[PDB]
């Protein structure tokens, strides 16, 4: 929702997430993408434990 605000599509390729857009992704949007990726990995580990 916060990515399409800047005009980007959140493509989910397996476990990985990418932003497909007409231009380069913003720094904060890339930071949020990396944050949710790391959080998803941490949440999988937390689910296991």
């Amino acid at each position: 929702r916060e990515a399409q605000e800047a005009g980007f599509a959140l493509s989910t390729n397996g476990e990985r997430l990418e932003l497909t857009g007409p231009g380069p992704v913003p720094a904060e949007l890339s930071a949020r993408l990396e944050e949710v990726t790391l959080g998803s990995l941490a949440a999988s580990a937390e689910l296991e434990v």
């Binding site: 720094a27 904060e28 890339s30 930071a31 990396e34 944050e35 790391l38 941490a42």
Partner: protein, 49 residues
Amino acid sequence: IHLAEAVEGLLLEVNRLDELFRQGSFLREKTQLEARFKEAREQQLEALR
């Protein structure tokens, strides 16, 4: 015994460090650093082009 307990806390602080590295501010700093490097590279090869 208090020193042993404190060291146990410090050894568990590895997970705290990992979560900090998954936090917002650190990832913003990381993405800004990578954006600066990527912008420098892009300027370099576009000057070459």
